[PDB]
């Protein structure tokens, strides 16, 4: 129609006319808004005037008019200003949209205002009118009593004080409800908020809020202490564990903390235990001995290892390149990992007599992979072969120390010192390549043992090997300073290292200091930004390669857009063949948590020009999709496996195997072909040395740890990060001048195990367990929805998929005290009748005491 009548009266210019035209105007603004728009100047003028009487109604109309144009922020200013005639406990479709826009606006001011001062929130200092709406929106959702909607908003508008109050008031212990809400908010804050300063604040508070309830969920409480990685958080927790003291629970908690936590963290945790005088039990756990021994006991019984596969593999190839000899020494170690059996190597000795220097060192270092899992029988086995004792070459004696450093990583306290005495000794001797190979293992070992704490004593020792400038040994020392100082480096250490790359004129020392520089910034995030630039600002190829690993490591875990943009950007815009391959490798580490997304980012790149790029995407998937069995990862890796370019075949074969470890025929139809393929390649002569290296080691992955391990970059037992594993794979992924360095895969094996542990017998039941996943769609390889009733036993192969449907039997002779929890990792029992065994076994810590 027309609004021209209504507007005519507005121009008459008195109080009555203003009010009548206003109350008319409110009703049909929306349809006739066009006509009214031209009088919007009078309306705004009436706004901040009061020569009339219509102000709050004028602001109201103006909001409606602005709205219909498509100026939402403009409307929002006036909707607020309408004041008493605008209410958010009254909704129309109109109301919904400008409240939505008012929050956005509020979000914008809050992002800026947090960065500026991190207690902006402790007062109003932002627009009062906005703040008012904001508190009231929070109240609305919460009166209706759905707490996920209210908490979502409070996050978004970057203020902490609302989060605290909101949750607090509705914690009414039900107990089921308090626990579940808090567990949701924890998961949320980690995965979706990389505003690192904000995220920590929410984590420390959500921890104290759960802790204060009389009922807690102790699994969730461990997550958050690992993440913030504080001894101080640990201490508060444990004194709370003193008040409700149970030996079963307190023991479980220590079996969790020892694996996940860092070396230094572990160290202050023994100190605080010693000084609190609470449990001498727990301090032994904190030394790591119990968990590793329990796995040994498991791997010895459930091993399925075959030397006939290694035999077949060796006879399938022909020697003519020392790369094959490495391949089978290494596939053997991996296969026979943890089972303490050297069996193959014991069987075949004439080939050993052939082997070059590096190949000898590797053969020796294979014992280390097998004998990991013993921190007291680890040292013992290697004693007849050390420097000063028997051997047959000094390369063999050098690999003895490399293999010791493999094992005793994660509790290198003794071994660092022990190795240091060998470093200082052999710095004089460099006259023979026999000593360079000895001092080369020596440097690897020490770097590996001293990881996660940072001892400057080791750094200063490995550095004088650089000044003496020995060609093999300088590579191990350089990489070794990076391993030792990981995530705990000096700023000074960065600067000294950085200058020395430039100084060094041996290719290997230059290569090792590049990679060396990437490691030392692990977990820094934005704090590494200064060094990223510096590595890329060096116009050396080695240093630009080295820069890419530095983002992957620093920004690891939960992904960060800025970090991916920079890496993809180098990958596209740099044409250097090392550089493009390293920046693709690097995406997989960032993206370990969000692994679904990696086949799409790398989709393109896998079918993209230049083989180094294609190589880099194989690795990306291999690291990122390891253990999950992502169907999308495998589909991308299939073409690449029979690619012309030999090292592309190789890396795809390594990659396939890491994802599909402990996944079988029937579960996946595709793996039979894959295993066939691995085998066929060794046997044909038409493949080249690099392709068969890929193939041999790939068999070795699938069949690793007697078929009972998976490769993961975290624990299942807390579901929180595991450092060692991440670090292992980045050294593993490179082999190009790094022909012996395969061995770093020992640190990435995690056993796939659900075993029960008696609380006071420390033994494993053998009993029948129930399961609903279909067994015989699980099989013994080589040599789908479920709810159907089924059975499994104890001390048999628990697969990833299986673990979810298993349940402890409750009613023989034990109580399982906190029960099973729908993920891998042990659960401590506390016994009804320890004094008769059900069908226990003796563990290996009771074979060597």
């Amino acid at each position: 129609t027309t609004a021209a009548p209504l507007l005519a009266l507005l121009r008459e210019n008195q109080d009555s006319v203003k009010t009548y035209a206003l109350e008319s105007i409110n009703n049909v603004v929306d349809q006739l808004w066009s006509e009214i728009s031209n009088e919007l100047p009078d309306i705004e003028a009436l706004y901040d005037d009061d020569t009339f009487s219509d102000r709050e109604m004028a602001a109201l109309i103006a909001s409606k008019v602005y709205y219909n144009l498509g100026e939402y922020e403009s409307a929002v200013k006036y909707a607020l200003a309408a004041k008493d005639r605008f209410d958010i406990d009254e909704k129309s479709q109109f109301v919904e949209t400008i409240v939505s826009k008012s929050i956005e606006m509020y979000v914008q001011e809050a992002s800026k205002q947090y960065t500026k001062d991190e207690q902006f929130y402790t007062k109003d200092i932002i627009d009062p009118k906005l703040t008012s709406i904001f508190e009231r929106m929070i109240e609305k959702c919460l009166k209706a009593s759905e707490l996920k909607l209210a908490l979502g908003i409070a996050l978004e508008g970057y203020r902490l004080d609302i989060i605290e109050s909101a949750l607090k008031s509705k914690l009414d212990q039900s107990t089921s409800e308090n626990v579940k809400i808090i567990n949701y908010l924890l998961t949320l804050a980690i995965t979706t908020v990389t505003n690192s300063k904000f995220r920590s604040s929410i984590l420390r508070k959500s921890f104290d809020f759960l802790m204060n309830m009389p009922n807690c969920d102790y699994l969730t409480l461990n997550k958050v202490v690992v993440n913030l990685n504080d001894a101080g958080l640990a201490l508060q927790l444990f004194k709370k564990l003193k008040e409700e003291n149970d030996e079963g629970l307190s023991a479980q908690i220590a079996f969790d903390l020892v694996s996940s936590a860092s070396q230094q963290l572990l160290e202050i945790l023994v100190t605080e235990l010693t000084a609190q005088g609470y449990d001498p039990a727990l301090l032994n756990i904190l030394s790591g001995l119990p968990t590793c021994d329990y796995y040994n006991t498991f791997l010895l019984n459930n091993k399925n290892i075959d030397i006939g596969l290694l035999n077949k593999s060796k006879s399938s190839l022909d020697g003519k390149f020392s790369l094959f000899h490495t391949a089978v020494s290494v596939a053997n170690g991996f296969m026979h990992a943890g089972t303490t059996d050297n069996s193959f190597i014991k069987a075949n000795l004439p080939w050993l007599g052939k082997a070059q220097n590096w190949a000898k060192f590797t053969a020796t270092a294979s014992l280390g992979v097998i004998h990991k899992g013993n921190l007291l029988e680890g040292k013992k086995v290697m004693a007849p072969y050390l420097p000063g004792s028997r051997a047959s070459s000094r390369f063999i004696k050098g690999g003895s120390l490399y293999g010791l450093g493999l094992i005793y990583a994660g509790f290198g306290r003794d071994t660092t010192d022990y190795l240091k005495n060998i470093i200082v000794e052999n710095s004089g001797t460099s006259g023979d390549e026999d000593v360079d190979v000895l001092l080369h293992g020596a440097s690897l070992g020490i770097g590996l043992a001293a990881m996660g704490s940072a001892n400057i004593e080791v750094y200063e020792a490995l550095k004088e090997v650089l000044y003496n400038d020995s060609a093999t040994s300088g590579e191990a020392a350089a990489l070794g300073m990076g391993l030792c100082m990981l995530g705990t480096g000096k700023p000074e250490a960065i600067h000294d290292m950085f200058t020395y790359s430039q100084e060094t004129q041996h290719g290997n020392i230059t290569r090792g200091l590049a990679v060396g520089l990437a490691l030392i910034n692990y977990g820094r995030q934005e704090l590494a930004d200064d060094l990223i630039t510096k590595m890329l600002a060096s116009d050396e190829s080695l240093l630009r390669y080295g820069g890419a690993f530095t983002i992957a490591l620093a920004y690891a875990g939960t992904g960060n857009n800025s970090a991916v943009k920079r890496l993809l950007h180098v990958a596209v815009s740099d044409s250097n063949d090392d550089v493009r391959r390293a920046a693709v490798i690097a995406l997989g580490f960032v993206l370990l948590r969000d692994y679904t997304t990696v086949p799409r980012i790398v989709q393109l790149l896998s079918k993209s020009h230049n083989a180094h790029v294609r190589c880099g995407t194989a690795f990306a998937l291999g690291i990122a999709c390891a253990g999950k069995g992502l169907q999308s990862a495998i589909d991308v890796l299939d073409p690449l496996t029979k690619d012309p370019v030999d090292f592309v075949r190789q890396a795809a074969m390594i990659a396939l195997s890491m994802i599909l470890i402990q996944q079988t025929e029937k579960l996946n139809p595709q793996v039979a072909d894959i295993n066939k393929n691995f085998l066929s390649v060794i046997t044909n002569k038409h493949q080249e040395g690099l392709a068969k290296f890929g193939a041999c080691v790939a068999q070795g992955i699938m069949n690793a740890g007697g078929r009972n391990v998976t490769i993961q970059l975290e624990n299942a037992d807390t579901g929180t990060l595991d450092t060692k594993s991440v670090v292992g794979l980045v050294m593993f992924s490179q082999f190009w001048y790094w022909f012996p360095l395969a061995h770093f895969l020992s640190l990435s094996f995690t056993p796939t195990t659900v075993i029960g542990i008696r609380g006071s017998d420390q033994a494993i039941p053998k009993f029948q367990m129930n399961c609903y996943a279909k067994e015989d769609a699980f099989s013994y390889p080589r040599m789908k929805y479920s709810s159907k009733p089924y059975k499994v036993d104890n001390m048999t192969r628990i697969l990833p998929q299986q673990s979810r449907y298993i349940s402890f039997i409750k009613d023989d002779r034990f109580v399982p005290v906190r029960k099973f929890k729908g993920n891998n990792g042990v659960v401590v029992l506390r016994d009804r009748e320890p004094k008769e065994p059900v069908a226990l076994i003796e563990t290996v810590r009771q074979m060597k005491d």
């Binding site: 996920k148 909607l149 908490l151 979502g152 908003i153 996050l155 978004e156 949701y184 949320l188 995965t191 979706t192 908020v193 992904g559 857009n561 991916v564 943009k565 993809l568 950007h569 596209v572 815009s573 044409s575 969000d594 997304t597 799409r600 980012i601 393109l604 993209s608 020009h609």
Partner: protein, 39 residues
């Protein structure tokens, strides 16, 4: 509200992937010209 956060991560990753494809095609047009000169 929680949901949106999940979805924003997928959107962002994708957005970068799209810009990166555009850039790659640029290096290829360049590569083509250079390769014709060499042949």
């Amino acid at each position: 509200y929680f949901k949106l956060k999940k979805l924003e991560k997928e959107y962002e990753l994708l957005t970068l992937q799209e810009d990166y494809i555009k850039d790659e095609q640029r290096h290829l047009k360049r590569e083509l010209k250079r390769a014709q000169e060499e042949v």
